[PDB]
Design a protein around this ligand. Structure first.
Ligand code: NAG
Ligand code: NAG
Ligand code: NAG
Ligand code: NAG
Ligand code: NAG
Ligand code: NAG
Ligand code: NAG
Lengths: 201, 596
């Protein structure tokens, strides 16, 4: 029939500020119509790599919920947003499962997220004792203990603050320029699936 | 847990914070160089002080991890680079005195202005006032006046300063478990811990003497030919049996002989390969020069320049209102930011310089994947050698015909190749005995082989023995004749040019064998050859992660610097010079026979 109540993709992609990768935003999208062809046919995205599903049948299938995770990483770190990868972002910041169904969308944001003095508002976790579980968020700011001595809450020797700032600048190389990444996770659960694609007339 | 994992986490923290501080410092230096203004000088000084203080604090933190409990070679190499005290081991009073001495030598060299007695109303600075006189004059007493007056003023200012400098630097070096400051400079080529590929600080002097003993016949024949031509230019001053007078070599110090090409040309009647007029006729902009250089580097298979390179580089002189340093410099600012600062004119020299500096940029881009403290050349020789090989390849007539800058009906006979090889010998071969003699003299000064009251008696003795250049009038110990040069007055190593010169022709033979060139080595061009670029990039990607001996094995298949590619490069010229020196006498006498 006639379709209304589109899914809020404007508040995810066109957000005025994005979160840091250590504190990545997760928005649960339910009970609306998700038009994925608007995203796929856009020329503004550099990465639209979908794992476990093809973009052409997204506009047909129907899902119970859609998880939209949004963060900012470097240009060289976009490859680590994939199942089975290894790196600082995958181990310590944002981990994707091997059995992941969804799409990883990334685009360059040197225009917005870089300033001439250096934009240090974006943080990433550099050290953690263990690798993250899939879809885990770590926002702890406790001092990393690399040595046998206790840190006692002070950053001294062998004790480092685990969150380190990015220093985005507009004169940076393409492997260091900021990239806004939105990861959509599609799951089907035994509840009635309500996020369906648009139906042609 | 373990010490090695602790060092690895410390190195990760260092890499990440040092890369951003080094960027900030490099950007401040760039903003000073493209905009010479006092607030930019202050911002540069603030960033440099932050960078140096951060390196002091990180070396202090780094020493707490002992070296012998780490087995990974790369981690141990970065920790070895970081744990050097530098001047920090010296006392604060002596460190401040050393820094003051270095700064005041920099000011004396930079702001040294000398002119003729009884005509003091205006005076000439070294660049470009004295450079043009040394490079273009044909008058004996004018060049003698300029040379002696600049060594009088500069040496008599710098001699007590250099006497303090040698003692302070030896004290700092022996506080750092080195024999002298010469051993500290020779420690750049020291490889330790690799089976078979180890290189010692004491092996460097032996290898330099062993290579120079093979240099010596070619330089003797070249010196005899240049002596005969300068005897034709100046009839009575030059003796057939003696050394060359010092102020007649075409430069201020004798560093290069390339300004004697007009006087010593073999076949003046034959044309030159000058392509300047051809670019002027086709209206080649500096942007076109750099795009043709980029086309050369993509033809060999290397990566092309970034968008940020074309956006952020200054490839043209800005204007009268904005001041900039005219010296061509390639900048690896960090974080994938690569720029070239060159005031590019439409000349062959600027075109070859564009190839040279883009070779520097390619070398910087290749080891961007390496950790921050390993982002350097394997030694100091490779970084300059990879630019000089591009300068070699771009200068060939095949490259000029291929890009259309030379007429396709230009006749390449043996006479043009002889005079081109002689120009390349005056640039390249002539700097080798001067470089070797200067470094051996500085090594003997630091080692204490030469006492302070005998520095100059030995120095001219070395110059007569090695360079074959005689002093015009004798100098006493009130003079400081070495420190009139930029590198020695500003605390720079000088053996990098000798090693660069030998590595240049070794890399050239390796890439020409890779490219399957079937003619003379100087006729070889490495464009259109993907395999030559791959063989180059295998060494280029390593950076400082691997020993320079292993990198040289990766390129040429040898574990040591070799002199035979240089002799093979100049072999047509060597046979021609041996033919031309039948009547004349090869070799010189160290006696005062021409003039003293
Ligand atoms: C986001 O911004 C782009 C550029 O202005 C626009 O074309 C697009 O329609 C916006 N919305 C979405 C959902 O991408
Ligand atoms: C150079 O410095 C002057 C002095 O403040 C400034 O007005 C100008 O914008 C600067 N130009 C560049 C290109 O940095
Ligand atoms: C040395 O450490 C690096 C990481 O810094 C690692 O990738 C490499 O495999 C290590 N080498 C050895 C021989 O353990
Ligand atoms: C650096 O200096 C300190 C203090 O003098 C000393 O303990 C340390 O061993 C030195 N490090 C090296 C590598 O010489
Ligand atoms: C470098 O080369 C690639 C492919 O060869 C090309 O797509 C790119 O546009 C080039 N870079 C520039 C700045 O033109
Ligand atoms: C160049 O080749 C010709 C032909 O053999 C010869 O006569 C002439 O001497 C050669 N000149 C030089 C400088 O080798
Ligand atoms: C190298 O390749 C380019 C690309 O076609 C070609 O124009 C040029 O002539 C080649 N160089 C030579 C020496 O043939």
């Amino acid at each position: 029939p006639n379709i209304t109540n589109l899914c809020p993709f404007g508040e995810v992609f066109n957000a005025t500020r994005f979160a840091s990768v250590y504190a990545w935003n997760r928005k649960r999208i339910s009970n609306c119509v998700a038009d994925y062809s608007v995203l796929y046919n856009s020329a503004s995205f550099s990465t639209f790599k979908c794992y476990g599903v093809s973009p052409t049948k997204l506009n047909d299938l129907c899902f119970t919920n859609v998880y939209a995770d949004s963060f900012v990483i470097r240009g060289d770190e976009v490859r680590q947003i994939a199942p089975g990868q290894t790196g600082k972002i995958a181990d310590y910041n944002y981990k994707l499962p091997d059995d992941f169904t969804g799409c990883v969308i990334a685009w360059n944001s040197n225009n917005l997220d870089s300033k001439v003095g250096g934009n240090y508002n974006y943080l990433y976790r550099l050290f953690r004792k263990s690798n993250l579980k899939p879809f885990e968020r770590d926002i702890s700011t406790e001092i990393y203990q690399a040595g046998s001595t206790p840190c006692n809450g002070v950053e001294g020797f062998n004790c480092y603050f685990p969150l380190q700032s990015y220093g985005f600048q507009p004169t940076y190389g393409v492997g260091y320029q900021p990239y806004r990444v939105v990861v959509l996770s599609f799951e089907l659960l035994h509840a009635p699936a309500t996020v369906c694609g648009p139906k042609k007339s | 847990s373990t010490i090695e994992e602790q060092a690895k986490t410390f190195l990760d923290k260092f890499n990440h914070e040092a890369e951003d501080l080094f960027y900030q410092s490099s950007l401040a230096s760039w903003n000073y160089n493209t905009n010479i203004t006092e607030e930019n000088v202050q911002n540069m000084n603030n960033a440099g002080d932050k960078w140096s203080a951060f390196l002091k604090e990180q070396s202090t933190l780094a020493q707490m991890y002992p070296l012998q409990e780490i087995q990974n070679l790369t981690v141990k190499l970065q920790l070895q680079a970081l744990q050097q005290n530098g001047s920090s081991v010296l006392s604060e009073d002596k460190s401040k005195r050393l820094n003051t001495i270095l700064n005041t030598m920099s000011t004396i060299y930079s702001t040294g202005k000398v002119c003729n007695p009884d005509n003091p109303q205006e005076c000439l600075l070294l660049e470009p006032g004295l450079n043009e006189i040394m490079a273009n004059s044909l008058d004996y007493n004018e060049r003698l006046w300029a040379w002696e007056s600049w060594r009088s003023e500069v040496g008599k200012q710098l001699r007590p300063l250099y006497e303090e400098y040698v003692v302070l630097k030896n004290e700092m070096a022996r506080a750092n478990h080195y024999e002298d400051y010469g051993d500290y400079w020779r420690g750049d080529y020291e490889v330790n811990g690799v089976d078979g590929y180890d290189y010692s600080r004491g092996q460097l002097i032996e290898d330099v003497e062993h290579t120079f003993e093979e240099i010596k016949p070619l330089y003797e024949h070249l010196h005899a030919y240049v002596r005969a031509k300068l005897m034709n230019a100046y009839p009575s001053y030059i003796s057939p049996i003696g050394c060359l007078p010092a102020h007649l070599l075409g430069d201020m110090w004798g560093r290069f002989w390339t300004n004697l090409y007009s006087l010593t040309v073999p076949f003046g009647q034959k044309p030159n390969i000058d392509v300047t007029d051809a670019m002027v006729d086709q209206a080649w902009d500096a942007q076109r020069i750099f795009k043709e250089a980029e086309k050369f580097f993509v033809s060999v298979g290397l990566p092309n320049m970034t968008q940020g390179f074309w956006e952020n580089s200054m490839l043209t002189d800005p204007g009268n209102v904005q001041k900039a340093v005219c010296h061509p410099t390639a900048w690896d600012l960090g974080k994938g930011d690569f720029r070239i600062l060159m005031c590019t004119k439409v000349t062959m020299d600027d075109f070859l310089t564009a190839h040279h500096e883009m070779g520097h940029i390619q070398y910087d881009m290749a080891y961007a994947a390496q950790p921050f403290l390993l982002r350097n050349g394997a030694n100091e020789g490779f970084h300059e050698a990879v630019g000089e090989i591009m300068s070699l390849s771009a200068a060939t007539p095949k490259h000029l015909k291929s890009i259309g800058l030379l007429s396709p009906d230009f006749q390449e006979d043996n006479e043009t190749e002889i005079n081109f090889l002689l120009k390349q010998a005056l640039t390249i071969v002539g700097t080798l005995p001067f470089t070797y003699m200067l470094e051996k003299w500085r090594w003997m000064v630091f080692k204490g082989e030469i006492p302070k009251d005998q520095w100059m008696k030995k120095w001219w003795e070395m110059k007569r023995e090695i360079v074959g250049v005689v002093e015009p009038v004798p100098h006493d110990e009130t003079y400081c004749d070495p420190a009139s040069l930029f590198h020695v007055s500003n605390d720079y190593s000088f053996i990098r040019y000798y090693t660069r010169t030998l590595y240049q022709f070794q890399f050239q033979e390796a890439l020409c064998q890779a490219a399957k060139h079937e003619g003379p080595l100087h006729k070889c061009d490495i464009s259109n050859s993907t395999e030559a670029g791959q063989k180059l990039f295998n060494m280029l990607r390593l950076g400082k992660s691997e020993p320079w001996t292993l990198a040289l094995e990766n390129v040429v298949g040898a574990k040591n610097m070799n002199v035979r590619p240089l002799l093979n490069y100049f072999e047509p010229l060597f046979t021609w010079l041996k033919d031309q020196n039948k009547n004349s006498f090869v070799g010189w006498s160290t006696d005062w026979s021409p003039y003293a």
